[model samples]
Target: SVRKFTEKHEWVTTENGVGTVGISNFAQEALGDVVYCSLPEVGTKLNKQEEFGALESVKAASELYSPLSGEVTEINKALAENPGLVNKSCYEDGWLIKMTFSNPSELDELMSEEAYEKYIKSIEE
Candidate 1:
């Protein structure tokens, strides 16, 4: 499965039309250690680039933006107690939500893995 990335550093991977959304490894690392997470309820609707949730760390609070327009179908239950899972396994066990796309074309506007890597590099320069 190919993962799509946003400039905001969120990633979403879809298979069979359902997408799992999470912060990227780079994002989690930049946030230091996650202490808390605010997630949307299931059935919440949002547009691409809309603020969906937030991750709070000792350093600061970082708002999470949706990479695609979608209705949240599920939220990760584990993060309620262990937000640090975002630091440990951002791409997998720490996924924030499962959603079905309201505008699949919005995904085309996001970065691919390679493009995102270059984007990260550009910002670092």
Candidate 2:
């Protein structure tokens, strides 16, 4: 039982058989304003660590990676019109995609909520 987070700062909240993925608060805070978001289209199949999108911030454009192997089941189309949503709310309104996990084992490789907190702490230090 865990909300697994990736090294890339993406979080996977898996409940039942579905996984919801999004960037962590730390990521948005670090990126500043989000001006552009280039996301994979729905139906695109991707592996863990694969680049699924890009976020253009005030400072730079950053790539977004998939936390697990899955097919893009949904995209946050709102970003196409309102990229600021990513900076305004990275976890909720800024969520990037909804994917159907193809390899659940990838979930086991991610950091848990506690572990993610620790990881953040470690990086902060």
Candidate 3:
């Protein structure tokens, strides 16, 4: 499955039309020790690039964005106790939410893995 990235550092991987959303490792590292995750309830509707929730860390609070327009299907309840999972397993066990996207074309607007890496490098410089 191909994972898509946002300039804001969000990532989404779709399987059978359901997209799993999360923050990138670069984002987690910048936040420095996540302590809380505020997520939307299931069935909430979202638009591409809309703020869906937030991640709070020792350094600051970071907003979470939806990679595509969709309705949230589920949220990671585990973050209630172990938000640090975002730092340890950002790509897998630490995923933030799952949603069924409304617009497939939105996928094209997101960056591919290689492009995202280059984008990150540019921002770092």
> lDDT per residue, candidate 3, 13-118, as tens digits?
9999999999999999999999999999999999998889999998899998889998999999999999999999999989999999999999989999999999
lDDT of each: 0.91, 0.84, 0.94
lDDT at position 91, candidate 2: 72
Q: lDDT by residue for model 2 over 6-29, one digit each (tens)? A: 888888777666678888888888
| Tens digits of per-residue lDDT for model 1, 1-125 | 69989888999999877889999988998999999999999999988878999999999899998887878999999999999999999999999999998777877888899999999999889
TM-score of 1: 0.96
Candidate 3 vs. truth: CA RMSD? 0.8
Top model number, TM-score = 3
Report the CA-based lDDT of candidate 1 relative to the real structure: 0.91
> Runs in model 1 with CA error above 4 Å?
none
Candidate 1 vs candidate 3: the TM-score winner is 3
Clashing pairs for predicted structure model 1, backbone only: none
Overlapping backbone residue pairs in candidate 2 total: 0
